[PDB]
Amino acid sequence: PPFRTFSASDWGLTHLVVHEQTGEVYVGAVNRIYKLSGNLTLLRAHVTGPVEDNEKCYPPPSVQSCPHGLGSTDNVNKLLLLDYAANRLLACGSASQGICQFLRLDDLFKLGEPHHRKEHYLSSVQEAGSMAGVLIAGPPGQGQAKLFVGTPIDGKSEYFPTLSSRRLMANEEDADMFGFVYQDEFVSSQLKIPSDTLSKFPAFDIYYVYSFRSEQFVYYLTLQLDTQLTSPDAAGEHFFTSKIVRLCVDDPKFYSYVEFPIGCEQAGVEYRLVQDAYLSRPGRALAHQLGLAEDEDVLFTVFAQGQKNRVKPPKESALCLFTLRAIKEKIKERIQSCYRGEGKLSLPWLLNKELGCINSPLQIDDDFCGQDFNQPLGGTVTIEGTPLFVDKDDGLTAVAAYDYRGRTVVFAGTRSGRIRKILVDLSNPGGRPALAYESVVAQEGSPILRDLVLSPNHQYLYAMTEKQVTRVPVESCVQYTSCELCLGSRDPHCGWCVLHSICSRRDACERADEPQRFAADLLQCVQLTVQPRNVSVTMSQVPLVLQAWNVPDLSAGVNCSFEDFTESESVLEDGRIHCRSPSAREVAPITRGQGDQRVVKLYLKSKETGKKFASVDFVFYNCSVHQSCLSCVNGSFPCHWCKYRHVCTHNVADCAFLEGRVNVSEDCPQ
Ligand SMILES: *[C@@H]1O[C@H](CO)[C@@H](O)[C@H](O)[C@H]1NC(C)=O
Numbered sequence: 060p061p062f063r064t065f066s067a068s069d070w071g072l073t074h075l076v077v078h079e080q081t082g083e084v085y086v087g088a089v090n091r092i093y094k095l096s097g098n099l100t101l102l103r104a105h106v107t108g109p110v111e112d113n114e115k116c117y118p119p120p121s122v123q124s125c126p127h128g129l130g131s132t133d134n135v136n137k138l139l140l141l142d143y144a145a146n147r148l149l150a151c152g153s154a155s156q157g158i159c160q161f162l163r164l165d166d167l168f169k170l171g172e173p174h175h176r177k178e179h180y181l182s183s184v185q186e187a188g189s190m191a192g193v194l195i196a197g198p199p200g201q202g203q204a205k206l207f208v209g210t211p212i213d214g215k216s217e218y219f220p221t222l223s224s225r226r227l228m229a230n231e232e233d234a235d236m237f238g239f240v241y242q243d244e245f246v247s248s249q250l251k252i253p254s255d256t257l258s259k260f261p262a263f264d265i266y267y268v269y270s271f272r273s274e275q276f277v278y279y280l281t282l283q284l285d286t287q288l289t290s291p292d293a294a295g296e297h298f299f300t301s302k303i304v305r306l307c308v309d310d311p312k313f314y315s316y317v318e319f320p321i322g323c324e325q326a327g328v329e330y331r332l333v334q335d336a337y338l339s340r341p342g343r344a345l346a347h348q349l350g351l352a353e354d355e356d357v358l359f360t361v362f363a364q365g366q367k368n369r370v371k372p373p374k375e376s377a378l379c380l381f382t383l384r385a386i387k388e389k390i391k392e393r394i395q396s397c398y399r400g401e402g403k404l405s406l407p408w409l410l411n412k413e414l415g416c417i418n419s420p421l422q423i424d425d426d427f428c429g430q431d432f433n434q435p436l437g438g439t440v441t442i443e444g445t446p447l448f449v450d451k452d453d454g455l456t457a458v459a460a461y462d463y464r465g466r467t468v469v470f471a472g473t474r475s476g477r478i479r480k481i482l483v484d485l486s487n488p489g490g491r492p493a494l495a496y497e498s499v500v501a502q503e504g505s506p507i508l509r510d511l512v513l514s515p516n517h518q519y520l521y522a523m524t525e526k527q528v529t530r531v532p533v534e535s536c537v538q539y540t541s542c543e544l545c546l547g548s549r550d551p552h553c554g555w556c557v558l559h560s561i562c563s564r565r566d567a568c569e570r571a572d573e574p575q576r577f578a579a580d581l582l583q584c585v586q587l588t589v590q591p592r593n594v595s596v597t598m599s600q601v602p603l604v605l606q607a608w609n610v611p612d613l614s615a616g617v618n619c620s621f622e623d624f625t626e627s628e629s630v631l632e633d634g635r636i637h638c639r640s641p642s643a644r645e646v647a648p649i650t651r652g653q654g655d656q657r658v659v660k661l662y663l664k665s666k667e668t669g670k671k672f673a674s675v676d677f678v679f680y681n682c683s684v685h686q687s688c689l690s691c692v693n694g695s696f697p698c699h700w701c702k703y704r705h706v707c708t709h710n711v712a713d714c715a716f717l718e719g720r721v722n723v724s725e726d727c728p729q
């Protein structure tokens with residue numbers, strides 16, 4: 060069937076998110092904020108630009124006068140999140156130093172847009188995709204909600220923090236919105252880049268890709284400019300280095316900060332340029348394969364080769380895997396290694412002067428949220444990842460995943476606009492851990508954007524490009540017509556509903572829990588055999604006996620349908636299906652014309668469904684047309700040559716005399 064489509068205006072899209080319950084689709088974009096419905100039908104929208112502003116205006120002209128001017132410029136939506144507790148939506152733009160609006164859920168009514176404080180502004184960058192974060196509501200009923208936000212600052216370190224823990228009041232008009240959850244004379248739930256570090260390398264910055272809540276913490280995948288591999292001259296050879304970061308939800312002074320490099324390799328190829336990430340529960344399959352508990356989560360990642368460029372990395376990309384276990388371990392290992400006095404905190408950009416690790420007798424837990432020394436703590440060894448798939452022709456751009464009845468499925472967007480469906484398994488008799496079993500095309504010629512989430516019923520995945528969104532069905536099982544290639548494609552959702560003769564999902568096959576109703580393994584397609592397989596046109600209604608294999612309890616009833624000429628009703632005994640061959644009256648127009656023999660499909664039509672599902676080849680033949688003694692005998696099937704009548708027939712009473720019976724080729728006359 061065709062692809063559900065939603066085009067865009069004259070500009071471009073940036074962010075999407077789905078209400079976990081209503082399945083509605085909120086879409087962030089330049090100047091606009093579209094809200095769609097379950098089938099990508101355009102609903103409500105909300106306009107936010109262009110506005111009169113200059114990037115050089117701190118504060119924006121809408122609060123205090125500015126020299127250097129202004130001019131109408133586009134307001135790119137950089138971040139977009141849902142506040143389920145307060146039933147609203149936060150869409151942060153790039154205009155007027157990046158204020159944020161609060162659109163009420165059910166009509167996008169501008170509930171507020173606080174735009175007059177210093178900490179009401181977030182960043183003056185014009186690029187999108189560099190901001191990310193999550194919300195954390197406190198105890199319900201008690202109107203506070205925390206919100207952890209990271210963004211680049213383009214060297215404007217006095218104005219905007221690069222990472223904070225601001226507050227969310229229930230009343231949007233309030234001026235305490237977006238205020239830091241802990242404020243004192245020196246440390247705040249903040250993290251400004253030192254004016255020193257920008258003095259070494261001018262436009263150093265932290266770009267923030269993904270962010271997810273896990274246990275009682277929040278993690279970020281950042282990408283910073285390398286303080287080592289880059290000379291102070293900021294020409295165009297500047298290299299970058301990807302690093303994870305982690306905080307506590309309950310850490311007001313921001314002592315728990317921690318930062319480890321990430322990457323992976325396969326066949327000696329380096330991958331250290333992060334692109335996208337998705338936090339998923341791995342499903343019972345990959346869980347027991349990896350040793351993880353049923354509540355422990357996993358993070359899929361996408362790294363580009365090398366450390367250069369970044370604004371347009373090279374195509375070669377890899378889909379690597381990091382376990383939440385191995386990360387809580389490398390953390391409790393670097394902060395256990397510190398609270399022992401070994402090494403030193405190693406954040407060359409945040410600390411400048413190499414403070415050393417301090418000894419301490421405190422014994423670290425899994426839930427240790429830092430103390431006033433040995434923080435913020437750096438990363439010494441680059442965390443290495445497990446490669447699942449590499450592609451060199453058509454680059455990878457986005458990722459997502461989920462589980463199906465144990466199995467672990469990975470969806471990956473491409474720069475060409477396709478979305479490959481990946482199955483990950485380590486015990487595959489190939490060694491290799493991932494197979495690209497499909498390549499749906501959502502829109503040729505447009506890179507997929509990194510936002511790529513499923514509907515609540517996990518049935519569809521909304522795939523957004525710059526130009527349009529495309530509701531692609533996960534279970535695209537219908538395209539396959541026969542058991543032989545429905546299960547041979549290796550789609551984990553697809554099995555063959557044997558009695559309905561269709562390739563579909565498991566719960567869509569009626570009564571599929573009873574034995575022999577759904578088809579799992581390739582060596583289990585329906586098989587039918589006939590005794591006898593061949594009969595001469597001279598015979599009529601001879602009783603056949605058929606043995607069907609891998610079929611359910613057919614006591615519901617089954618018919619013998621000879622293509623579309625007869626519909627004999629059958630009887631069932633033990634494991635065999637008895638029914639009658641056609642009468643030669645039915646057979647007559649069938650062989651009228653063909654010549655030597657004709658094969659016909661013996662189907663099994665079930666009474667429960669009414670549709671034919673099992674096939675087997677059945678053959679008729681007519682010994683008459685054969686002209687010589689060798690034409691008769693050497694034919695495969697049992698034909699008798701009547702040497703005295705000079706004809707070829709079946710039933711030997713047809714010969715001139717018995718002694719005219721010629722069965723074998725050697726009894727031919729010369
Ligand atoms: C989408 O669903 C709504 C639900 O009422 C329906 O009115 C609308 O016609 C549908 N549009 C498309 C294109 O499927």
Ligand SMILES: *[C@@H]1O[C@H](CO)[C@@H](O)[C@H](O)[C@H]1NC(C)=O
Binds near residue numbers: 589590591592593697
């Ligand atoms: C015809 O059918 C009989 C019984 O099913 C089988 O033994 C024989 O080998 C078959 N021969 C041909 C030529 O199909």
